[PDB]
């Protein structure tokens with residue numbers, strides 16, 4: 152194919168959801184929201200990563216939305232654009 156996800160295993164939303172087992176208690180965004188936006192937990196801090204583009208996102212602020220931050224930093228991501 153003409154595109155390729157950075158992390159094929161994390162193609163699955165359920166796999167992304169499971170990655171949040173040890174998501175920090177200070178991290179306010181829900182694993183549901185984050186997984187839905189293509190993001191899984193890297194195991195470091197509040198840093199997640201997109202399965203598709205491989206972009207990372209961390210240091211989440213109140214008012215942040217997963218999709219909106221994904222699109223702001225990584226607007227040409229095929230998951231964003233799909």
Ligand SMILES: CN[C@@H](C)C(=O)N[C@H]1CN(C(=O)c2ccc(N)cc2)c2ccccc2N(Cc2c(OC)ccc3ccccc23)C1=O
Pocket residue numbers: 198207208209210211212215220224
């Ligand atoms: C308010 N909403 C939150 C989600 C937010 O916008 N957080 C910032 C914080 N952030 C960092 O924490 C950061 C990134 C790289 C780095 N060397 C140091 C700090 C960023 C800083 C500058 C540009 C982009 C980011 N990025 C995205 C980002 C990048 O944006 C293109 C690039 C590299 C990144 C590496 C690790 C984590 C994030 C990276 C953020 O997610």
Ligand SMILES: [Zn+2]
Pocket residue numbers: 189201202203204205206221225228229230231
């Ligand atoms: Zn992406």
